[PDB]
């Protein structure tokens, strides 16, 4: 049925507004991460931003036109050091998957919008993993484990693919001469 005049219609626009702002914030944090010398984290912020663009797109497509007023609170700033930005981002994701989306989903089910409710719930799953990544990286920075580990492992240069074996990433990639910032733990998800 039509969304016109329902609380769900307003919730969809509210989520869209928030997701849109999240996309921008994450891209800015991505740029800051690059400046702070964390390439993997920078690319993670950028990817998360792109995924927020997609959450927003799915939501936007449910709407049926017209201007709708909304009342909501949003983060008024700010861009800080990468550790701080990761913490703030995780907090945002936390609110979204623990409070906002579940509430919106329940109301959607209440008003008889099962498909939309399912989408809200599904997006919440994505946000929980978004938070996990942000919290994990924040922890790595705080513990000084971004580029150094207890036991020898494999590190990959994101710039050229060089693989380094050792307890930590090298100061300079021997293959492309780019700085340590480009290294990440070698991952194999296939
Ligand atoms: Fe997210
Ligand atoms: Fe390299
Ligand atoms: Zn999202």
Curated annotation (Swiss-Prot):
It comes from the Bacteria. Residues 1-145 form the Ferritin-like diiron domain. It is found in: Cytoplasm. GO terms for molecular function: iron ion binding; oxidoreductase activity. Pfam families: Rubrerythrin (PF02915), RUBY_RBDX (PF21349). InterPro entries: Ferritin-like (IPR012347), Ferritin-like_diiron (IPR009040), Ferritin-like_SF (IPR009078), Rr_diiron-bd_dom (IPR003251), Rubredoxin-like_dom (IPR024934), Rubrerythrin (IPR052364), RUBY_RBDX (IPR048574). Residues 152-190 form the Rubredoxin-like domain. The keyword Cytoplasm applies. Keywords: Cytoplasm, Electron transport, Iron, Metal-binding, Transport, Zinc. Its cofactor is Fe(3+). Homodimer. Possesses two rubredoxin-like centers and two non-sulfur oxo-bridged di-iron centers per dimer. May provide oxidative stress protection via catalytic reduction of intracellular hydrogen peroxide. NCBIfam families: RuberyRbr. This is Rubrerythrin. It comes from Nitratidesulfovibrio vulgaris (strain ATCC 29579 / DSM 644 / CCUG 34227 / NCIMB 8303 / VKM B-1760 / Hildenborough) (Desulfovibrio vulgaris). The lineage of its organism: Bacteria, Pseudomonadati, Thermodesulfobacteriota, Desulfovibrionia, Desulfovibrionales.
